[PDB]
């Protein structure tokens, strides 16, 4: 199984708050991060059999790796599928310049199956173009929209930083190591519970991980697009950690 | 006004 190529073809959703319920296992890199009592609190992205990429703020207030478990291959949030892989975390690596991104080393390698496949990493320092339609997935808050309890997806366009940072929108808050995605009209967004999961953009024949869900001014509000850590600016760090640990 | 999107979220006055 090559990276970024689901064995169930994803549904499109032109037009997680809003969006739609994903086809089961069409996002086989989506991870659920769980407390010791099994509560989902963040997403993550499998990027190789032993490594999950997530957001630093999902973990930083409880650094000990035994505090976390990783659920792979799931579609429902509760009452997990039978062949779901639950794997413990052996090591945690926070990004050294203190961006909102972090690596989890799994205590044993995930078994790569038709339901558990890594996303591809982008080219270093690639800047996803303005208006590129990408996909954001997770089990987070739906703000009254349908699909709570099931893996949801939002199809949202990238908004280039120079637009997103305008006074009327996020007013200078967005760093070059972040990107914006969403509809400025509002209505569709990642929300609480989605942090740490993927924003992927289809390129040629596979999905490339371009963002890590991070923050926003609320969710799905007009003029307030979601902010994601820009993965391409950390590919060298990610590959260094994986090769040396 | 930032809310980081964990569950529960990490929110600030900014």
From Swiss-Prot, chain A:
Disulfide topology: 3-120, 13-20, 42-58, 134-201, 164-180, 191-219
All residue ranges annotated as the Peptidase S1 domain in the record: 16-243
Active site: 57 (charge relay system), 100 (charge relay system), 195 (charge relay system)
Residues annotated with Phosphoserine modification: 32, 123
Domain of life per record: Eukaryota
Protein name as annotated: Plasmin light chain B
Organism: Homo sapiens (Human)
Lineage: Eukaryota, Metazoa, Chordata, Craniata, Vertebrata
Gene: PLG
Parent sequence residues shown: 565 to 810 of 810
Curated annotation (Swiss-Prot), chain B:
Keywords: Disulfide bond, Protease inhibitor, Serine protease inhibitor, Signal
Cross-link entry Cyclopeptide (Gly-Asp), positions: 1-14
Annotated site location: Reactive bond: 5-6
One GO BP: negative regulation of endopeptidase activity
Disulphide bonds in the chain: 3-11
Modification after translation (UniProt): This is a cyclic peptide.
Claim: Disulfide bond is one of the keywords in the record: yes
A GO term for molecular function: endopeptidase inhibitor activity
Tree of life domain: Eukaryota
Job of this protein: Inhibits trypsin, cathepsin G, elastase, chymotrypsin and thrombin. Does not inhibit factor Xa.
Protein name (Swiss-Prot/TrEMBL): Trypsin inhibitor 1
Species in which this protein is naturally found: Helianthus annuus (Common sunflower)
Native organism taxonomy: Eukaryota, Viridiplantae, Streptophyta, Embryophyta, Tracheophyta
């Amino acid at each position: 199984f090559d990276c970024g190529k689901p064995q169930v073809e994803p549904k499109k959703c032109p037009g997680v708050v809003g969006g739609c319920v994903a086809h089961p296992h069409s996002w086989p890199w989506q991870v659920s991060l769980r407390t010791r009592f099994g509560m989902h609190f963040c997403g993550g992205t499998l990027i190789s059999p032993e490594w999950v990429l997530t957001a630093a703020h999902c973990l930083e207030k409880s650094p000990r790796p035994s505090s976390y478990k990783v659920i792979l291959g799931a579609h429902q949030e509760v009452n997990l599928e039978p062949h779901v892989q639950e794997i413990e975390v052996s090591r945690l690596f926070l990004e050294p310049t203190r961006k909102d991104i972090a690596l989890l080393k799994l205590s044993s390698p995930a078994v790569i199956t038709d339901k558990v496949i890594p996303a591809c990493l982008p080219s270093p320092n690639y800047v996803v173009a303005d208006r590129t339609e990408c996909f954001i997935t997770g089990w987070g808050e739906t703000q009254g929209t349908f699909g709570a309890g099931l893996l949801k997806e939002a199809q949202l366009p990238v908004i280039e930083n120079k637009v997103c940072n305008r006074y009327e929108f996020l007013n200078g808050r967005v760093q070059s190591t972040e990107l914006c995605a969403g509809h400025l009209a509002g209505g569709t967004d990642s929300c609480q519970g989605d942090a740490g999961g993927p924003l992927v953009c289809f390129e040629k024949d596979k999905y490339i991980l371009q963002g890590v869900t991070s923050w926003g001014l609320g969710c799905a509000r007009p003029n307030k697009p979601g902010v994601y850590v820009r993965v391409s600016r950390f590919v060298t760090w990610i590959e260094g950690v994986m090769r040396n640990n | 006004g930032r809310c980081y999107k964990s569950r529960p979220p990490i929110c600030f006055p900014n």
